[PDB]
C-alpha cells in the first residue's frame, strides 16, 4: 500500500557521470563504453552564446581542449564529433560501469527519473514528466547542464534526457541523447518562452485508478461520458484531450479495477466541477499528472 | 529553479542489497562488510508470527537454512544471531562494494531515501519522513521487507531504517539498522495501529523558505508573532511545537531570504486560520512537511555525493 512518486534506482547513472570542462566552462558529461556525450554549448563563450556557430566554434578546438573527469581520474580525449544538440568526445577507457543501455526519444505525459549533478557529481534523483509544452518541471541550479533523465525498465537503463537551459519561468529544457531538443527550443540565449502549459489528462486518469487500486472511491459517481463530451469540458480546464490510444492504455487499470475509462473520465469531469471538498487523493489536494498508466501499474502491482 | 521531492543517489546502497531465503519465506538484506542483515520475521511460518518465539525459532536454524544471493552468486552463510528484531547472517565474503556507512537511529521529522527492493534487487527510490506517530508513508509490497532507508551525510551512508511491516491504514513500520522499531510496534502479527499524526511543523517552516527562494511569495505578510503564541495555534491545529532549536536550525533561511522564523511563523498561522484561497505553494495545495532544513538548504545549494 502507498502511492508515492517513485524515481528508479540511480547507480547504474551515477557509475557514468564525469564532468566535462572546455576553456571556463564546467558541465556534466554522460560517460558509456568510450564515449563521453554533453551538452554542444560547453565550447561556448559568454560572447558566443546568442548565435553560436557550433560548427564554427568546434572546428577551433582540438582534443586537449576537452579535460573529462571520472572520478578523480582525467580521461584522454582522442575524438570529437558533434550530434545535433550534444557533443560526443571520444575517449581512450571504455566505463567498465557501463550497463546495459538504449537510447530513448520520449513523447509528452511520459515520467522519467533525473540524477541532477554539479561537477560530475550526483547530487540527487527524482521524479519528472515531459509536459504537455515540451518542458520540465525539474530541480536544477548553475553547473546542472548534462545531467540526465532515465527510465530502468528490467536492467536496461533507457536514456532519454540531457539538460541544457533553463527557461525564464525556471522551467526546464533539453534534448534526447542524440541532441534533438524537446519542443521548439535551441541552444541559444535568445529570447524563449515555455508555450502554455496543460495537464496530461492521461495521466491524471490512471492517478484516479492508483487511488481506487489503494481503496480511495469518494471521487466515484454513477455517471459515464462519452469521449466528445469530457474533452469539450476537460479542456476549459486546460487539460490535454483525451485520445482513443489514451483509452486503450488506461484498458488494464480499468479492468483491474472494475470502473470503465469513460466512467473515470465522469469522476474527473466533477472534480474539476467541484474541487476535493477538504479532502485528499492518496495524500494530495491537488490532481497529479507525473504518474502514467504505467508507472501506476509497476508501482501498484 | 525547481524544486522537487529528491532522494540521495542510491548507488552505494544498491551494492549492498541482498536477497534473504528461509524456507518458504524470501525477503531482502543488507551485505555490509561480512553480515546480511534482515528482518528477524524471515525465519516465521504464518503460524509462528501469531505468537513467535524468536530465540526459539532461531535455535532450530542452522547456516544453510539460509540462502543469500547477491546478485546470481550464492553466498555462504556461517553465522547467525539475533539484534533485537534484526538477523545477523555472518558470510564468508565480505563485500566488495561495502562503502563508508554508519547506523544511525533518526527522530521524527528527519527525512531519508529509501530504496525499495524485491527478491534483492533495487525497484525504486523515494523521500519520505519519520512521522510524529513513528510511522513511515512508505509505497511497499509483498517482499518489500528488508528494504532500507538511509541518508548521506558527505562520503558516508547513514543507514536508518529497515522495512519490517505495513498496518491497516497502509503506512509502514520498521526498524534502525540495530533492530529497535520505531514506534511502540511489535514483529508479530497482532492488533496494532498507528496513532493519531501530526504535521511536521520545522518542515513545513523550510518548505515556506523554499518557495520564497523559488519566488512564491503570496503568504507572506507584514506580521510576526511569538514563539508561545505561534505554538497555541500549532497545538490547535495537531502541529507538532516550533522549539527554539528549530527556530535555530532555521536561522540560515530566514537571513538568507529575510523572513525571520516568527515572520514566517505569521505566514503559517494565517495559512492554518485561512486556508490557501485557491492558491497553491510549489504546485502544492496542502503545506509540505516532509523537507527539513537542511533538505532545502543542500536542494538550494546543489550538494554533491
Ligand atoms: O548552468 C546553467 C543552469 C542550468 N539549469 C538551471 C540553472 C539555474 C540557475 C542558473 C543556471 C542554471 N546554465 C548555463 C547554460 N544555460 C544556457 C543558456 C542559453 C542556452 C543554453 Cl543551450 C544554455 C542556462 O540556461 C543556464
Ligand atoms: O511483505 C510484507 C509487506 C510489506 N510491506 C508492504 C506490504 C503490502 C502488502 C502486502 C505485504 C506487504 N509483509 C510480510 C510481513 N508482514 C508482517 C506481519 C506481521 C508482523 C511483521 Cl513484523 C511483519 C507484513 O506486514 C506484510
Ligand atoms: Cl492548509
Given at each position: 500500500?502507498?502511492?508515492?512518486?517513485?524515481?528508479?534506482?540511480?547507480?547504474?547513472?551515477?557509475?557514468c557521470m564525469?564532468?566535462?570542462?572546455?576553456?571556463?566552462?564546467?558541465?556534466?558529461?554522460?560517460?558509456?563504453?568510450?564515449?563521453?556525450?554533453?551538452?554542444?554549448?560547453?565550447?561556448?563563450?559568454?560572447?558566443?552564446?546568442?548565435?553560436?556557430?557550433?560548427?564554427?566554434?568546434?572546428?577551433?578546438?582540438?582534443?586537449?581542449?576537452?579535460?573529462?573527469?571520472?572520478?578523480?581520474?582525467?580521461?584522454?580525449?582522442?575524438?570529437?564529433?558533434?550530434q545535433?544538440?550534444?557533443?560526443?568526445?571520444?575517449?581512450?577507457?571504455?566505463?567498465?560501469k557501463?550497463?546495459?543501455?538504449k537510447?530513448?526519444?520520449?513523447?509528452?505525459?511520459?515520467?522519467?527519473?533525473?540524477?541532477?549533478?554539479?561537477?560530475?557529481?550526483?547530487?540527487?534523483?527524482?521524479?519528472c514528466?515531459?509536459?504537455?509544452?515540451?518542458?520540465?518541471?525539474?530541480?536544477?541550479?548553475?553547473?546542472?547542464?548534462?545531467?540526465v533523465?532515465?527510465?530502468?525498465?528490467?536492467?536496461?537503463?533507457?536514456?532519454?534526457?540531457?539538460?541544457?537551459?533553463?527557461?525564464?519561468?525556471?522551467?526546464?529544457?533539453?534534448?534526447?541523447?542524440?541532441?534533438?531538443?524537446?519542443?521548439?527550443?535551441?541552444?541559444?540565449?535568445?529570447?524563449?518562452?515555455?508555450?502554455?502549459?496543460?495537464?496530461?489528462?492521461?495521466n491524471?486518469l490512471?492517478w484516479?485508478?492508483?487511488?481506487?487500486?489503494?481503496?480511495?472511491?469518494?471521487?466515484?459517481?454513477?455517471?459515464?461520458?462519452?469521449?466528445?463530451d469530457?474533452?469539450?469540458?476537460?479542456?476549459?480546464?486546460?487539460?490535454?484531450?483525451?485520445?482513443?490510444?489514451?483509452?486503450?492504455?488506461?484498458?488494464?487499470?480499468?479492468?483491474?479495477?472494475?470502473?470503465?475509462?469513460?466512467?473515470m473520465?465522469?469522476?474527473?469531469?466533477?472534480?474539476?466541477?467541484?474541487?476535493?471538498?477538504?479532502?485528499?487523493?492518496?495524500?494530495?489536494?491537488?490532481?497529479?499528472?507525473?504518474?502514467?498508466?504505467?508507472?501506476?501499474?509497476?508501482?501498484?502491482?
Open positions: 500500500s502507498g502511492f508515492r512518486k517513485m524515481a528508479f534506482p540511480s547507480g547504474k547513472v551515477e557509475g564525469v564532468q566535462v570542462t572546455c576553456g571556463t566552462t564546467t558541465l556534466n558529461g554522460l560517460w558509456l563504453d568510450d564515449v563521453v556525450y554533453c551538452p554542444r554549448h560547453v565550447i561556448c563563450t559568454s560572447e558566443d552564446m546568442l548565435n553560436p556557430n557550433y560548427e564554427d566554434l568546434l572546428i577551433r578546438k582540438s582534443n586537449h581542449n576537452f579535460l573529462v573527469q571520472a572520478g578523480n581520474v582525467q580521461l584522454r580525449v582522442i575524438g570529437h564529433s558533434m545535433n544538440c550534444v557533443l560526443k568526445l571520444k575517449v581512450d577507457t571504455a566505463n567498465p557501463t550497463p546495459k543501455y537510447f530513448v526519444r520520449i513523447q509528452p505525459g511520459q515520467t522519467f527519473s533525473v540524477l541532477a549533478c554539479y561537477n560530475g557529481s550526483p547530487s540527487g534523483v527524482y521524479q514528466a515531459m509536459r504537455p509544452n515540451f518542458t520540465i518541471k525539474g530541480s536544477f541550479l548553475n553547473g546542472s547542464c548534462g545531467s533523465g532515465f527510465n530502468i525498465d528490467y536492467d536496461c537503463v533507457s536514456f532519454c534526457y540531457m539538460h541544457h537551459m533553463e527557461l525564464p519561468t525556471g522551467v526546464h529544457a533539453g534534448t534526447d541523447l542524440e541532441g534533438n531538443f524537446y519542443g521548439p527550443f535551441v541552444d541559444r540565449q535568445t529570447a524563449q518562452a515555455a508555450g502554455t502549459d496543460t495537464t496530461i489528462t492521461v491524471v490512471a484516479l485508478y492508483a487511488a481506487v487500486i489503494n481503496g480511495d472511491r469518494w471521487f466515484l459517481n454513477r455517471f459515464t461520458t462519452t469521449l466528445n469530457f474533452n469539450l469540458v476537460a479542456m476549459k480546464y486546460n487539460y490535454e484531450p483525451l485520445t482513443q490510444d489514451h483509452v486503450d492504455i488506461l484498458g488494464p487499470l480499468s479492468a483491474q479495477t472494475g470502473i470503465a475509462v469513460l466512467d473520465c465522469a469522476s474527473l469531469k466533477e472534480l474539476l466541477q467541484n474541487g476535493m471538498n477538504g479532502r485528499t487523493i492518496l495524500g494530495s489536494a491537488l490532481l497529479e499528472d507525473e504518474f502514467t498508466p504505467f508507472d501506476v501499474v509497476r508501482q501498484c502491482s
